[PDB]
Symmetry: D2
Subunit: 298 residues, 4 copies
């Protein structure tokens, strides 16, 4: 009994795909605030969630926003928050905390400029205090935003960890085609710091996920994969370093275009054990890479 179309193609935005995906995954607690460009995730939840006997909690404070979800999670709910920019910085203690408690919870960081951007890749990985491991996923299309949100809620439960869906304003706002399956076509997974880290890092084979098929060629993520279309980075963390190694050997140079000053780049160069030149095509300040721009540069 879902208040949106299921079992059929539809044309939705990112924020809406996420908000639909979450609900089908089992999430009946959302805690957030209307802020651009997450405020559409909010509106969708605010619209849909009361009609599925779920609850939306409009919290002022990002600190409070994430804490309420950790709290709903512990009282049994599947739960999510959503934020942007320096809000995401505010949530790092409670995220860190959710790591140690092995709390299932999903966080959406909708990246932004000031207009998409890709400058929270490292903070998504290392912003927590201490030794920790959590999962970070990066959607390149509106269909991936739908699918990864499902996967996030599934991973969050299976590995009893927070999951970060790391996206951008453009994927979030741009309308595209999403096939939304019927409820029962969807597998949903029901419900010291050495095992915590190993929980994640020893299972990259299950949690890591990449797209790329050019075995006969001489790497990006998010809204920059679509304009670079190539190695597709979907699972940002835990990160398969060896895979980048194997690909280093089989090619001459590895171009890493990002909307930052080098973050995805670093993991690539550390991945490529010297066995290929690694270069960054950085654009920042608003526009995604136009494919002519990535084109020329190479």
């Amino acid at each position: 009994r879902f208040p949106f179309p299921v079992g059929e193609p539809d044309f939705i935005q990112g924020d809406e795909a996420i908000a639909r995906a979450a609900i089908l995954a089992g999430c009946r607690f959302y805690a957030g605030y209307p802020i651009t460009p997450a405020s559409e995730i909010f509106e969708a939840m605010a619209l849909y969630m009361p009609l599925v006997d779920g609850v939306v909690i409009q919290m002022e404070d990002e600190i409070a926003s994430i804490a309420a979800a950790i709290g709903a999670s512990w009282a049994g709910a599947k739960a999510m928050t959503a934020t942007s920019g320096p809000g995401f910085s505010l949530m790092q203690e409670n995220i860190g905390y959710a790591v140690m408690t092995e709390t299932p919870v999903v966080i959406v960081d909708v990246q932004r400029s000031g207009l998409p951007a890709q400058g929270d890749i490292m903070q998504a990985i290392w912003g927590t205090h201490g030794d920790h491991s959590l999962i970070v996923l990066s959607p390149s299309t509106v269909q991936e935003a739908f699918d990864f949100t499902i996967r996030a809620f599934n991973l969050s439960e299976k590995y009893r960890t927070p999951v970060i869906l790391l996206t951008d304003a453009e994927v979030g706002h741009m309308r595209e085609r999403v096939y939304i399956p019927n409820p029962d076509e969807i597998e949903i997974i029901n419900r010291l710091i050495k095992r915590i880290v190993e929980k994640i890092e020893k299972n990259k084979k299950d949690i890591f996920t990449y797209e790329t098929y050019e075995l006969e060629d001489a790497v990006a993520t998010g809204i920059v994969a679509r304009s670079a279309l190539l190695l597709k980075i979907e699972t940002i963390w835990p990160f398969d370093f060896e895979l980048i190694e194997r690909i280093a050997e089989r090619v001459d140079k590895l171009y890493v275009p990002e909307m930052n000053l080098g973050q995805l780049y670093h993991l690539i160069k550390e991945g490529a054990n010297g066995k290929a030149e690694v270069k960054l095509i950085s654009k920042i300040g608003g526009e995604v890479h136009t494919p002519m721009e990535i084109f020329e540069f190479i």
Copy 2:
């Protein structure tokens, strides 16, 4: 199946009576941090709550601490936090928020000096932004700390409101006799801003509660009722102004001893429509009133 004595007298501290009372009331979510003198409420919960299939959440941030409980409450749990001093100030937005959402949640403010004190009476009433109404209870004994905690959880549900149990370090730490009933001897109540305010303020007859029987005489709360033992103030808010009126007429002077510089005093003088002299015996800086001190002064 409770991990502490039930259906029998026992001798416990305030923090322990509260922590026992909460659990018998149905609370299976506690979110707090060890701070004096609330850190004993924590320890007791941390000790007892895992053995009743409940959960304790050690949160750094008081802002986060209260938000997690609002969140657990909305996902269905009966929930409580506990705090002291400027922590209580931090929780005022989320409390205010719990008021508007009509969220059942219980908050313990354990008052302090720097050593009890009584300087959060007004902040308990008016610290929220806006127009609101919530309930505030004040225990004078260890048995009242037990009983009011029960009543708090019952009122919180019935009137769908936050309830503040406003206590002090001394009541909290001092060992006294508590009769703890057996589980089934306890009635527990299962689960715009004009009706909100009226919800509470129109039902003072049910929510207001005082102790005093001297119809032949010529007023305090908390640890200061025991040393003044008299009108006993138990329900601080919603406040029965008329009752203080009726008592004004029947007496000459009304002495209001508090451990502050006048807070309970003000409600008394506003209650006494001029119909009696109202005077405050203020001691602050550590010790409760020794009854000799209240004695002399009158």
Copy 3:
């Protein structure tokens, strides 16, 4: 060398009068965030302050916003923040803190609905934890917003205390006539908890300020004084209780119209030692009292 008109009448909004007044008073530190209806105070400061060799600090967090000003104050600056609604709740710990440290700082709480409102009168007085005293001023016109801001900065220094300028969206946004004096026509005052409280409360004769001249008659504050135009409440705290007493005797009934459910009312009834009937004309939900509405009711 001021980047706005001085020594002459002009027609400005509230937020602009405040922002002009502050600068003439000596304030060279403002820390805030653009939020309605304080975001105009911000814009004005952001516009004017760089041209007077001052500094504006755009802080996300209201907690941080007030802390930065307490910090600038201690490093020697005259300083101010500005906020609205549940933001004001967030600042209560740091305000409380500024009280104990005897820190000069000015805070503007721009009251709001959801559209003015008057529901932070009590929170302005009692939202701090503990025993404290601070000053609260209430402007009824755009000229009073200018003048009280000056007075706030002067009182803040003289009594080494925080000062709260408690205003509303309407006074803030409405254009009126302000005479702005020339710089040198303005007197500006250069730079335990028992003396703190007495600092303020023993000097009501200097800090308290009211407007009303009807000795031959049979009381409001803010945007509701202009529509009730009568006793004008300008200094909200410290509060002259005796004055309301003297006025109680000389009249039959005292009407207290507020945009809340009774806050100014309570101080009035406690002021009137029974010696006059006290009644509240409460409107909430948007519009100020239209004078026909206050008119009929009486």
Copy 4:
């Protein structure tokens, strides 16, 4: 006129060396809270700073703690805060903010277990939201804690940036010999996001600083350099990647012992462009590496 010994050797703890160094550097604003093991930095400041006409501000909230210093800095003061663990997480937004504003301020993160630890190396670098660059220094001795604190205040001013002094509980608490120079033997430096990043990253030659002299050999930081005594890592960020490259070639294997699960390690492996095997000796859970432990393993 300094209230501690100058111009002579003395034997002090880390927290005391830091607190002495800061004052000699020109810092007259400290804002913090007593927490282990930073609470000694506090006590020292609280003791010394009033006697140099400076100010210490005891703030509850780490968010507020850092904001007050950013604020004091902007009103002209040289300023510092100090924190530990999830406190450091709370400060990431305001740090990020200090980056964009090009605010000189110094932050001490005293690393900890639960007992030193080294699990905030990455968070020190990448915990800010967005694209940014700041400086991070790591003291290995009590004399380096003194000296780097000086250098921090000097770098903070010269590059108009926040500086993070990244230390640990052990260096902080352990007594050692510090030569404290006389005041005038100390050079102190008086007072978009593409130039910000380049400000730092283009000047590694001045900001980067390492200790190691074994050109005839076949790498650690903090309390783990002393027990590994070798390449000494002092400037953690901006990081000289090429230097690690040059050292990779000249040796067979590079052992990176840390008290974490690999953080310093990653920068090393990314530094070593495949040109040497890189291995981590991780101990976590309390004790520093005993040199026998690092010894055996190799």
